[PDB]
Amino acid sequence: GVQVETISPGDGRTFPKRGQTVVVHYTGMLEDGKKFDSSRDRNKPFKFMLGKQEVIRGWEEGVAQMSVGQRAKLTISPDYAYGATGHPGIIPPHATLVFDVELLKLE
Ligand SMILES: C=C[C@H]1CN(Cc2ccccn2)C(=O)[C@@H]2CCC[C@H]1N2[S@](=O)c1cc(Cl)cc(Cl)c1
Ligand SMILES: [Cl-]
Ligand SMILES: [Cl-]
Ligand SMILES: [Cl-]
Ligand SMILES: [Cl-]
Ligand SMILES: [Cl-]
Numbered sequence: 001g002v003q004v005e006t007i008s009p010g011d012g013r014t015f016p017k018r019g020q021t022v023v024v025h026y027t028g029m030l031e032d033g034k035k036f037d038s039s040r041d042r043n044k045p046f047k048f049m050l051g052k053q054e055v056i057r058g059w060e061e062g063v064a065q066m067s068v069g070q071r072a073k074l075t076i077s078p079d080y081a082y083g084a085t086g087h088p089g090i091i092p093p094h095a096t097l098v099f100d101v102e103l104l105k106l107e
């Protein structure tokens, strides 16, 4: 599944809702901490629509349990990420993923 561990607090009250555009910054790491992607390095907030399944399951469920302004660590099992196959060239087989996510805004 996905485990969400708080890093810095949000408002404790405003959570993503189905159909909202969710705006975050993130860094993605393999289980051992090897960074593979970051919106921060691009200086480009990342947006996805909750419930559209355009991001992995661990994001759908993990970011939805964050409140606006929160920074949190999401630890995502392979079955909530890219599974047995992974995504060749960046996500290896059966990879547990760790994301450092900040929920910036809902629009
Ligand atoms: C590249 C941006 C997305 C990619 N997706 C959705 C996705 C779309 C198409 C193929 C694989 N995954 C995702 O669900 C997750 C979580 C949101 C942030 C990024 N990823 S991962 O960090 C990721 C980052 C990169 Cl550069 C490539 C891939 Cl295959 C996966
Ligand atoms: Cl979107
Ligand atoms: Cl999107
Ligand atoms: Cl969308
Ligand atoms: Cl790979
Ligand atoms: Cl297993």
Ligand SMILES: [Cl-]
Pocket: 077, 078, 094, 096
């Ligand atoms: Cl595992």
